[PDB]
Amino acid sequence: SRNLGPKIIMLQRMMIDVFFFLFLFAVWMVAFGVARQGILRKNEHRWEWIFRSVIYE
Amino acid sequence: SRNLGPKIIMLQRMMIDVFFFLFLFAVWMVAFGVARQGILRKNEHRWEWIFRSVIYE
Ligand SMILES: CC(C)CCC[C@@H](C)[C@H]1CC[C@H]2[C@@H]3CC=C4C[C@@H](OC(=O)CCC(=O)O)CC[C@]4(C)[C@H]3CC[C@]12C
Ligand SMILES: CC(C)CCC[C@@H](C)[C@H]1CC[C@H]2[C@@H]3CC=C4C[C@@H](OC(=O)CCC(=O)O)CC[C@]4(C)[C@H]3CC[C@]12C
């Protein structure tokens, strides 16, 4: 494009920052979800809802 | 990691900014909550709800 090409190519340099962001976010999600689910619920025997309440929410 | 370690270490330098942000936020929260609670409610004799409507909201 001569106006969009450089900006599009720039995206290749943000991958490290995105990966760091995702790493921190995933760690926090896992910790908080496991803590809450264990705190305010009893044994769950449905696998889908474990990930639906630990990861998705 | 050689890719995440520097960024993780950088977090130690943001504490002053975070503290300033929290200080301003807390001052504003206290002021606004006390003002509103006094304006639009009568005497409250339940301690939990004082902090639930002055700080939490
Ligand atoms: C709604 C679905 C079922 C049909 C397709 C919807 C259209 C609105 C899409 C299809 C192709 C798209 C276009 C594909 C290519 C371009 C050119 C693109 O860049 C430029 O116009 C100039 C580029 C330059 O300056 O170098 C801007 C968006 C546009 C019009 C896209 C915007 C929206 C379009 C027309
Ligand atoms: C859902 C609960 C009940 C079980 C645990 C969920 C998993 C999805 C968690 C547990 C341990 C986590 C991992 C701990 C360590 C790492 C490596 C970490 O960094 C790298 O992959 C490369 C590091 C580098 O390049 O130096 C990225 C996240 C990952 C896979 C974490 C992402 C998510 C994992 C697999």
Reduce the DSSP state of residue B35 to 3 states and report it: helix
The answer to whether A16 contacts chain B (CB < 8 Å) is: yes
User: Are residues A47 and B34 in contact, defined by beta-carbon separation less than 8 angstroms?
Assistant: no
Cβ pair B7:A20 closer than 8 A: yes
- Pick among B1, B2, B7 to test the A interface (most A CBs inside 10 A): B7
Instruction: Report CA Rg, chain A.
Output: 19
User: Are residues B33 and B53 in contact, defined by beta-carbon separation less than 8 angstroms?
Assistant: yes
Give me B24's structure tokens.
């301003």
A34-52 b/e (C-beta count within 10 Å ≥ 16 → b): eeeeeeeeeeeeeeeeeee
Q: Is the CB of A6 under 6 A from ligand 1?
A: no
Q: What is the resolution of this structure in A?
A: 3.3
Give me A19's structure tokens.
């990966």
User: Are residues B37 and A50 in contact, defined by beta-carbon separation less than 8 angstroms?
Assistant: no
Q: Tell me how the structure was determined.
A: cryo-EM
User: Are residues A23 and B5 in contact, defined by beta-carbon separation less than 8 angstroms?
Assistant: no
